[PDB]
Structure formats: structure tokens, C-alpha cells
Amino acid sequence: AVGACVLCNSQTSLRCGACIRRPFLCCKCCYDHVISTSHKLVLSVNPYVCNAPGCDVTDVTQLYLGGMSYYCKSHKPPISFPLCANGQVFGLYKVTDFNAIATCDWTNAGDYILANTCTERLKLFAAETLKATEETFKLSYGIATVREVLSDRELHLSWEVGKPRPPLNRNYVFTGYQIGEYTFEKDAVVYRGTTTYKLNVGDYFVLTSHTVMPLSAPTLVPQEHYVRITGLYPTLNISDEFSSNVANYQKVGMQKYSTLQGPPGTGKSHFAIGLALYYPSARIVYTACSHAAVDALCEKALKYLPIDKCSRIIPARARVECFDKFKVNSTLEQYVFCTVNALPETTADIVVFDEISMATNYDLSVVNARLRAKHYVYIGDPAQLPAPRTLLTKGTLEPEYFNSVCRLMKTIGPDMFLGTCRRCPAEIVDTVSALVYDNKLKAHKDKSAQCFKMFYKGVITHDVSSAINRPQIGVVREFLTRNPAWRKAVFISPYNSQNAVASKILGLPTQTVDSSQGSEYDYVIFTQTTETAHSCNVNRFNVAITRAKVGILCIMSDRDLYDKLQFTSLEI
């Protein structure tokens, strides 16, 4: 019952009982909270409630200290002090932004803006409160009791009446009943059990509600600049392959943390792994939120770093298959490849945090909490996709509010910028360079003359809310008959249900924009599907068209993004 004031650190016995996280508040700040919000329950060793038998007054503003106990106006003795007076709440050791964070429901973009422009201790309160709210919201959805099992990849479901039905995408991972995690796709539904199990009829699914642990460490440790490379020993023999990155590698050694903005195909993996070869004795933990981001860092390490000094950390509650060519769960190897949520408690010379646009402030804090390191390197791109905010339905979250690193990158600039895209035909590089990189991204490749755009609104049907555009798929089917080189193309759209239809009609492999992030393919076919905020988001569009190494076909719904594409227009 004794702790520090989440606003000014001052010791107190006073927690707010109305805040979902029950933060410790000092007398001066607990007042400014209760007097300006619907929050009136103040906890101590014992709650600030009327001690009179049967009295239900819990509002600290209506309570008084009578000797040792607390009473309301109706019950207090003649000699009694009001608990709230003179800008304080009586406690031992005797905020506008804190109020907005503490009370918001996290459905509005402005909630995320504030959780990212506030003080550092408020960024942790914000992140804890948000994640708790996200988790206690999951308790508010319908169960899917299995009616019948068609095959090993399809079954039918009966849905609980009175509670809403959650979106059936790869984003929403259920828990079967403890028959392991289970996802679904687009009355025949496509079931995907993490553990292979002959699905029993009557068995029920419920969503994976995890307990939100408190945060302690800041999002970003305080910044230190050094005169010389600190606690790292560079090679003199550095392979020409990594000669480009030498000055940035010395920058990494000469400050506590560094930010690298690398646009698509600019050499992020190359940079991350090239750091190990430039500081060859340095212990490096390689971390990202997703298994796929960590597995990409593994593939690059496999090519350049000795395989005996590399470990892939895999949590015993295995969710999806991941990188299988390192020693598994050897925490003490020089090179450790681990998702944030599985990180062990250890130390390092360098921590490399990759795909930083997908990190939340909760993720940034957990890393600083589990890994004590001489240098933190933050790699990603604020022009790429953020983590989905399940509760955010109103307003759009701008890149400068994704997390503390993206905010730094969007305000003061990144410490290091990889400025040459080596993956994409020039037509794509020129488009995104102007769209999201203020003309600072340069093309290595020539124009491919295999980058095509077509303006075709088509017809938009919906599977619930997920959009489908069959005529857009029809246009692709026609294009494929005349363009056999594209038979190998990955189909990409902003919608699962569009992808499900494209899968059956075209037989192409299928990716959402969001699942395509970090991947590259020779040929991409993109159907915008709709002109919504979701399908027109410049970050999503940037990711969509930068997957392609040789050619891209964009069937567009939005005039603006269509006119911006520096592609050959097709007719029909």
C-alpha cells in the first residue's frame, strides 16, 4: 500500500481505485485527479469510505477524517477535517493529460496522440491502461461452439446469442477447448489449429485474454552521446559488402540509442547483421514483435554470422512455426533472435529492435525492462504499417504517434536514413519517394516497364465489413490471359475476403498488405478493392507497391493514389 506518484514520484499511500490500473498518486496530484474526473474512490491501507455501519459514501470529496477513521458529512464527528481541501487529499508524506489517459475508452485517435506526446511516466501509464482496456474488452464477445466438421481445413460454427461476433481474420487468434490456439478465414469457414487436432463437435473457442503486467522501464532510456565508441571494439578488416554502413556503425557506438529509418529494400537486415561483423566480439540481441520479423533477421544472420553463436528463442506455448536452423532456447549464445514477448532477462552490448513501426510503447518498455545493454538500435520505417489498435475506430493514427521511436523519427528526424531502394523498379521507388519520403528515396534499379495501373472502381460487396470487388478480380483474370509472366504473381489487397475470392478465381497466392510487410515477390497484383481510409492509407499503399522486385499491376479505386502512381496506365 506504499508507492510512488505516477506524475511527480512523491511517495504516498493514495492509489486511485477508479483507474483500471490503480496508480499511486501523491496528495497534491490525487486531488487534481478526483476534483476534475468521475474518479472519486481513493485507496490506502484501507479504502477512503465512510466507516459508519451501512453507509455507502465512497466519494473522497464527500468524506472527512474523524480522529483515525473516515466518515461522510452525515456521520463525521464535530472535530473532523475534509479529506479533500487546500489542493490536497489527506494521506501520508503530505495531470490534465493524466486525467484524459485515465478516463478515455481508447476508441479515438486523440487518445493515442496524448499517450505519445505526454511525459515518459505517463507513456507507461497510458500503455498499461490501453493494454488492460484492450484485454478486458476481449471478455465482451460471443463463443463459437462447433456444430459440424467438414474436413481437416473446414468446419461449421454456432455463435453465442446476445454477444457480438469477432472479425474472422489471422489477427484474431482464439484458444480452443486447452487444445492450442486456433484462427479462421472466409456456411463453410476455414479453421487453422496451431496444434493438429481432429476438431471435436461441441468443443468451444474463446479469445486469448492475457493478464497485463505493469511497466517499470521507460519506452526509451535517456539519450547519451559519447566522444568515442563505448564498450564496443570495431574490426579494421570490414568486408566491402558492409563498407557503406561504417560511419553509421561508428554512430551506433558513439550514443546510447540510435534510430534507423530504412524505406523498403534499402538494406535494414543487411545493416542489422553488418553491425555484428563491425563489432565482432559484441553480444547482440535481435528482437521484433513478430516471429516473421525475427525469422527474417535469422535468415540474414545464417548467411553472414557463424551458426554456432546464434540461438532462436522460442516460447514453450508455440503459436506458429518459425526459424529452425539455429540452436533453440540457448539464451547465452553471442547472437540471440527472440520476439519481444518471449525475451529472457539478460544483458547485451547491442540490442537491435527491428520493424519498429509495428512496436507499441508497451513493447518499447518491455524491451528496456528485460534487456540491459550498452547500445539500443531501433530499425524500421514510420512510412510503413503500425500495430493494429483493436479499440481505435475514430480518427487516423499518424506515424509520429505509432510509438516513441517513430515520434523521434517524425519530429527530429532519424539518426540514420538508408536512402537507396535496391528491390523495386524505379516507377515504384519514384512513386513512394514522392508519396511518403519527401523525395529522399533513390532508385538503384532502372524502370522495369512492368509496372501497370488501371482505374476500375468495379462493385463492392461485403462479407460483414471485409470488402470484396469481384469485377476488380475479373479485370486481373483478363490481364493474366495476356500476361503469362505474371502467373507466378502474389495477389495483394487490403482485405482478407477479397483475397479469399482472388484465391479461388485466380489460384494466385494471396497476402493482405499488412501480412506482406517485410516480404518481396517478383510480381505483385494489387486490387485496392474499395476507396476507404483503410484502402487509401498512404503507409498501407507504400507497403503494398514496394513488395514488387520486377512488376506490379494496381487496379485502383482512388483517383488521387491512381494519379500518383508513376506507372503505365492500361485500358478497359
Report the 10 Å Cβ neighbour count for 563. Answer: 11
Find the Cα–Cα–Cα–Cα dihedral 200, 201, 207, 210, rounded to 10°. Answer: -40
Q: Is residue 158 a contact partner of residue 189, using CB atoms and an 8 Å limit?
A: no
Binding piece for Zn ion, criterion CB under 5 A, among 8-16, 59-67, 131-139, 249-257: 8-16
Query: Site for Zn ion (CB under 5 A): which residue of 29, 124, 426, 460?
Result: 29
444 assigned binding-site residue: no
118 assigned binding-site residue: no
Q: According to the binding rule CB under 5 A, does residue 561 interact with Zn ion?
A: no
Q: Is residue 256 a contact partner of residue 300, using CB atoms and an 8 Å limit?
A: no
- Alpha helix locations (H) across 305-356? none
262 assigned binding-site residue: yes
Comparing CB distances to Zn ion, the nearer of 18 and 489 is: 18
Q: According to the binding rule CB under 5 A, does residue 555 interact with Zn ion?
A: no
Q: Is residue 104 a contact partner of residue 181, using CB atoms and an 8 Å limit?
A: no
> Residue 200: enclosing H or E segment and its boundaries?
none
Comparing CB distances to Zn ion, the nearer of 26 and 550 is: 26
Comparing CB distances to Zn ion, the nearer of 16 and 451 is: 16
Comparing CB distances to Zn ion, the nearer of 36 and 347 is: 36
268 assigned binding-site residue: yes
Task: Name every residue whose Cβ is closer than 8 Å to that of residue 54 and which is 6 or more positions away in sequence.
Answer: none
Q: Binding to Zn ion (CB under 5 A): which residues in 34-53?
A: 39, 50, 52
Comparing CB distances to Zn ion, the nearer of 53 and 484 is: 53
210 assigned binding-site residue: no
The least distance separating Zn ion from the CB of residue 114, rounded to whole angstroms, comes to 15
The least distance separating Zn ion from the CB of residue 66, rounded to whole angstroms, comes to 10
Q: Residues 128-154, buried b or exposed e (16+ Cβ, 10 A)?
A: bbbbbbbbebeeebbebebeeeeeeee
Binding piece for Zn ion, criterion CB under 5 A, among 17-25, 257-265, 292-300, 468-476: 17-25
The least distance separating Zn ion from the CB of residue 218, rounded to whole angstroms, comes to 18
Q: Binding to Zn ion (CB under 5 A): which residues in 93-122?
A: 102
Cα of 199 vs its chain's centroid, Å: 31
**How many chain residues interact with Zn ion (CB under 5 A)?**
17
Q: Is 438 exposed, middle or buried (0-12, 13-18, 19+ CB in 10 A)?
A: exposed
263 assigned binding-site residue: yes
What x-and-dash track marks residues 57-96 binding Zn ion by CB under 5 A?
x--------------x-xx---------------------
8 assigned binding-site residue: yes
Comparing CB distances to Zn ion, the nearer of 102 and 467 is: 102
State how far the alpha carbon of 220 is from the alpha carbons of 8, 129, 316, 351, in Å: 19, 19, 29, 12
> What HEC string does 482-527 produce?
CCHHHHHCEEEECCHHHHHHHHHHHCCCEEEHHHHCCCCEEEEEEE
Q: Is residue 90 a contact partner of residue 65, using CB atoms and an 8 Å limit?
A: yes
The least distance separating Zn ion from the CB of residue 13, rounded to whole angstroms, comes to 13
Which of 390, 358, 434 lies closest to 172, judged by CA? 390
d(CA 503, CA 25): 55
d(CA 502, CA 497): 9
- Side-chain-side CA neighbours of 280 within 13 Å: the count stands at 10
289 assigned binding-site residue: no
DSSP character at residue 439: T
Q: According to the binding rule CB under 5 A, does residue 432 interact with Zn ion?
A: no
Comparing CB distances to Zn ion, the nearer of 74 and 239 is: 74
Comparing CB distances to Zn ion, the nearer of 50 and 502 is: 50
Comparing CB distances to Zn ion, the nearer of 18 and 524 is: 18
Q: According to the binding rule CB under 5 A, does residue 26 interact with Zn ion?
A: yes
The least distance separating Zn ion from the CB of residue 31, rounded to whole angstroms, comes to 10
Report the 10 Å Cβ neighbour count for 242. Answer: 20
Question: Position of cell 516473421?
Answer: 292
451 assigned binding-site residue: no
Comparing CB distances to Zn ion, the nearer of 26 and 424 is: 26
Note the maximum CA span of the chain: 93
The least distance separating Zn ion from the CB of residue 72, rounded to whole angstroms, comes to 3
Q: Is residue 18 a contact partner of residue 39, using CB atoms and an 8 Å limit?
A: yes
72 assigned binding-site residue: yes
In the chain, count H helices and then E strands. 16, 33
Query: Site for Zn ion (CB under 5 A): which residue of 1, 2, 55, 434?
Result: 55
The least distance separating Zn ion from the CB of residue 67, rounded to whole angstroms, comes to 15
Comparing CB distances to Zn ion, the nearer of 39 and 268 is: 39
Comparing CB distances to Zn ion, the nearer of 102 and 356 is: 102
360 assigned binding-site residue: no
The least distance separating Zn ion from the CB of residue 41, rounded to whole angstroms, comes to 8
Query: Site for Zn ion (CB under 5 A): which residue of 7, 350, 405, 436?
Result: 7
d(CA 101, CA 361): 14
Q: Is residue 173 a contact partner of residue 208, using CB atoms and an 8 Å limit?
A: yes
d(CA 434, CA 521): 23
Residue 295's SS3 state is helix
406 assigned binding-site residue: no
33 assigned binding-site residue: yes
Query: Site for Zn ion (CB under 5 A): which residue of 13, 14, 15, 19?
Result: 19
Q: Is residue 357 a contact partner of residue 386, using CB atoms and an 8 Å limit?
A: yes
The least distance separating Zn ion from the CB of residue 134, rounded to whole angstroms, comes to 18
447 assigned binding-site residue: no
Query: Site for Zn ion (CB under 5 A): which residue of 13, 15, 16, 407?
Result: 16
Q: According to the binding rule CB under 5 A, does residue 18 interact with Zn ion?
A: yes
75 assigned binding-site residue: yes
84 assigned binding-site residue: no
What x-and-dash track marks residues 261-290 binding Zn ion by CB under 5 A?
------------------------------
DSSP character at residue 279: S
Task: Name every residue whose Cβ is closer than 8 Å to that of residue 461 and which is 6 or more positions away in sequence.
Answer: 467, 468, 469, 470
Q: Residue positions in the annotated binding site?
A: 5, 8, 16, 19, 26, 29, 33, 39, 50, 55, 72, 75, 262-269
- Residue set of the binding site for Zn(2+): 5, 8, 16, 19, 26, 29, 33, 39, 50, 55, 72, 75
* Residues found near Zn ion in the complex (CB under 5 A): 5, 7-8, 16, 18-19, 26, 29, 39, 50, 52, 55, 57, 72, 74-75, 102
